[PDB]
Design a protein around this motif. Structure first.
Motif, PDB file in Angstrom:
ATOM      1  N   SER A 111       0.902  -1.303  -0.016  1.00 56.30           N
ATOM      2  CA  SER A 111       0.040  -0.057   0.108  1.00 56.30           C
ATOM      3  C   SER A 111       0.850   1.175   0.215  1.00 56.30           C
ATOM      4  CB  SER A 111      -0.900  -0.264   1.235  1.00 56.30           C
ATOM      5  OG  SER A 111      -1.870  -1.140   1.325  1.00 56.30           O
ATOM      6  N   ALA A 112       0.337   2.347  -0.862  1.00 57.23           N
ATOM      7  CA  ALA A 112       1.029   3.497  -0.536  1.00 57.23           C
ATOM      8  C   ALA A 112       0.864   3.928   0.914  1.00 57.23           C
ATOM      9  CB  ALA A 112       0.347   4.662  -1.339  1.00 57.23           C
ATOM     10  N   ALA A 140      11.869   3.843   3.977  1.00 56.17           N
ATOM     11  CA  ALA A 140      11.347   4.667   3.138  1.00 56.17           C
ATOM     12  C   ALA A 140       9.919   4.443   2.822  1.00 56.17           C
ATOM     13  CB  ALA A 140      12.009   4.574   1.863  1.00 56.17           C
ATOM     14  N   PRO A 141       8.934   5.238   2.453  1.00 58.36           N
ATOM     15  CA  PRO A 141       7.524   5.136   2.245  1.00 58.36           C
ATOM     16  C   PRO A 141       7.265   4.809   0.807  1.00 58.36           C
ATOM     17  CG  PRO A 141       8.073   7.236   2.385  1.00 58.36           C
ATOM     18  CD  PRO A 141       9.301   6.695   2.673  1.00 58.36           C
ATOM     19  N   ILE A 142       6.267   3.840   0.550  1.00 61.48           N
ATOM     20  CA  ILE A 142       5.802   3.766  -0.835  1.00 61.48           C
ATOM     21  C   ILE A 142       4.963   5.037  -1.335  1.00 61.48           C
ATOM     22  CG2 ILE A 142       4.299   2.370  -2.515  1.00 61.48           C
ATOM     23  CD1 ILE A 142       5.054  -0.083  -0.727  1.00 61.48           C
ATOM     24  N   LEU A 143       5.454   5.580  -2.266  1.00 69.20           N
ATOM     25  CA  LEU A 143       4.814   6.891  -3.022  1.00 69.20           C
ATOM     26  C   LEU A 143       3.565   6.293  -3.818  1.00 69.20           C
ATOM     27  CD1 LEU A 143       7.859   9.057  -4.035  1.00 69.20           C
ATOM     28  CD2 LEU A 143       6.538   9.059  -1.627  1.00 69.20           C
ATOM     29  N   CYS A 162       7.310   3.738  -6.915  1.00 73.20           N
ATOM     30  CA  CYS A 162       8.236   4.463  -6.220  1.00 73.20           C
ATOM     31  C   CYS A 162       8.505   4.508  -4.857  1.00 73.20           C
ATOM     32  CB  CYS A 162       7.998   5.956  -6.776  1.00 73.20           C
ATOM     33  SG  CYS A 162       8.418   6.517  -8.436  1.00 73.20           S
ATOM     34  N   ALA A 163       9.521   4.782  -4.212  1.00 74.43           N
ATOM     35  CA  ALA A 163       9.553   4.815  -2.851  1.00 74.43           C
ATOM     36  C   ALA A 163      10.663   5.621  -2.491  1.00 74.43           C
ATOM     37  CB  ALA A 163       9.699   3.461  -2.225  1.00 74.43           C
ATOM     38  N   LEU A 187       8.393  -9.499   0.665  1.00 74.13           N
ATOM     39  CA  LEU A 187       9.405  -8.902  -0.360  1.00 74.13           C
ATOM     40  C   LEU A 187       8.452  -8.187  -1.369  1.00 74.13           C
ATOM     41  CD1 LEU A 187      12.263  -8.660  -1.563  1.00 74.13           C
ATOM     42  CD2 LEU A 187      11.946 -10.664  -2.884  1.00 74.13           C
ATOM     43  N   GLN A 188       8.436  -6.948  -1.325  1.00 75.68           N
ATOM     44  CA  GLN A 188       7.462  -6.282  -2.092  1.00 75.68           C
ATOM     45  C   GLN A 188       8.131  -5.524  -3.372  1.00 75.68           C
ATOM     46  OE1 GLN A 188       4.306  -6.307  -2.330  1.00 75.68           O
ATOM     47  NE2 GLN A 188       3.556  -6.729  -0.537  1.00 75.68           N
TER      48      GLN A 188
END
Ligand code: CA
Length: 223
Positions: A111-112, A140-143, A162-163, A187-188
């Motif tokens: 998920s973002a 780091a977050p998922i954008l 993107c992250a 593992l994403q």
């Protein structure tokens, strides 16, 4: 990894180093005989190094196993980096322990806004150049897909996400390629590409592993 932290020895037990006389890419151990990496990391003559912290010192928990086969995704496009994923089969099974362990494949996509852990031995500056000896880590977050597409117009496919941070300062980098992006214990992502490292409005771009689980399972079941 730019703007990250020292992980701690063997706190990321699924992280591998790919070595062809030197470290050149990361990867992730998904069971005792298989590693996932980026197709743009393809080389002949790969040795997989497991249980690593300092890649330049033998500390005692390593396993060094030669690859028997590499399999780049059938639809990999080196121009666009679409389908930037490769499997590597080990010649012999790894011994799984507290220092060497596999990471789960995802059942659903991430998920973002999820905070993920990215790790590797890649460059720690922009175009300054400095490579670490010990494993580095980054949260780091998922954008959102719309922010991703805005940063790289005409370049993002449904097999990428993107992250990172639009302000810059924190990112993966050259040498981290092929390594893991782990979100909620799965593992994403695979470190794939970006414009530079840690540049403003140029986040990291990662292979979307959840789109490849069927291919991974079928390939492992046949090789
Ligand atoms: Ca070592």
């Amino acid at each position: 990894i730019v703007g990250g932290y020292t992980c701690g020895a063997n706190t990321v037990p699924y992280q591998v180093s790919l070595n062809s006389g030197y470290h050149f890419c990361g990867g992730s151990l998904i069971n005792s005989q298989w590693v996932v990496s980026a197709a743009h990391c393809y080389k002949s003559g790969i040795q997989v190094r497991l249980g690593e912290d300092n890649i330049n010192v033998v500390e005692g928990n390593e396993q060094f196993i030669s690859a028997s086969k590499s399999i780049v995704h059938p639809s990999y496009n080196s121009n666009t980096l679409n389908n930037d994923i490769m499997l590597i089969k080990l010649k012999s099974a790894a011994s799984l322990n507290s220092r060497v362990a596999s990471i789960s494949l995802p059942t659903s996509c991430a998920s973002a806004g999820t905070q993920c852990l990215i790790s590797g031995w890649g460059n720690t500056k922009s175009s300054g150049t400095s490579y670490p000896d010990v494993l580095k880590c980054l949260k780091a977050p998922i954008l959102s897909d719309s922010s991703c597409k805005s940063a790289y117009p005409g370049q993002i496919t449904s097999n990428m996400f993107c992250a990172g941070y639009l302000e810059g300062g924190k990112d993966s980098c050259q040498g981290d390629s092929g390594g893991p992006v782990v979100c909620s214990g799965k593992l994403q992502g695979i470190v794939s590409w970006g414009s530079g490292c840690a540049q403003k409005n140029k986040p990291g771009v990662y292979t979307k592993v959840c789109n490849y689980v069927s291919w991974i399972k079928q390939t492992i079941a046949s090789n």
